[PDB]
């Protein structure tokens, strides 16, 4: 019921500004509030939010979301631990079987790479990619701390 608690929370959020009609769009794509807080308008369009007034309303509400930090702030010890912190433990096997078996390799993965190997849910793709860019920034700053 983590996924159940999460989806209830996505519905209650939408309901409070009367756009609960998109609940299935977000939930079927595996969006949770944390990932939703980082959506762009194109991400809304990709889940079927195409009417400009709805898309702009949602965009305005997302900018107002205040939710606690959830991205890890360090390069974790391994893939398993990293997936577990971000709530995506279920993709471990498919990631490993496809050649993304350690944190270093996962840092270079792209949206297109996910699509190819069967991680097709847009919300999960978004969350993975937000986490991956956090890793890439850590890696990019690592030798530049003086």
From Swiss-Prot:
Function: May link the scaffolding protein CASK to downstream intracellular effectors.
Name of the coding gene: CASKIN1
Subunit structure: Binds the CaM kinase domain of CASK. Forms a ternary complex with CASK and LIN7A, LIN7B or LIN7C. Competes with APBA1 that forms a similar complex with CASK and LIN7 proteins. The tripartite complex CASKIN1/CASK/LIN7(A/B/C) binds the cytoplasmic tail of NRXN1. Polymerizes, via the tandem SAM domains, to form long, 8 nM wide fibers, upon which other proteins can assemble.
Subcellular locations according to the entry: Cytoplasm
Protein name as catalogued: Caskin-1
Residue stretches making up the SAM domain: 5-68, 74-138
Top-level taxon: Eukaryota
Residues of the full protein shown: 470 to 605 of 1431
Species this chain originates from: Homo sapiens
């Amino acid at each position: 019921t983590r996924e159940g608690k999460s989806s209830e929370a996505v519905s209650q959020w939408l309901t409070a500004f009367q756009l609960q009609l998109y609940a299935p769009n977000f939930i079927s794509a595996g969006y949770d509030l944390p990932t939703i807080s980082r959506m762009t308008p194109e991400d809304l369009t990709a889940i079927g939010v195409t009417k400009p007034g709805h898309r702009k309303k949602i965009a305005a509400e997302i900018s107002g979301l205040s939710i606690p930090d959830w991205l890890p702030e360090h390069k974790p010890a391994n893939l398993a631990v990293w997936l577990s912190m971000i709530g995506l433990a279920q993709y471990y096997k498919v990631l490993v079987d496809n050649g993304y078996e350690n944190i270093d390799f996962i840092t270079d993965i792209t949206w297109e790479d996910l699509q190819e190997i069967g991680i097709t849910k847009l919300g999960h793709q978004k969350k993975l990619m937000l986490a991956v860019r956090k890793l890439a920034e850590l890696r990019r700053h690592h030798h530049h701390h003086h």
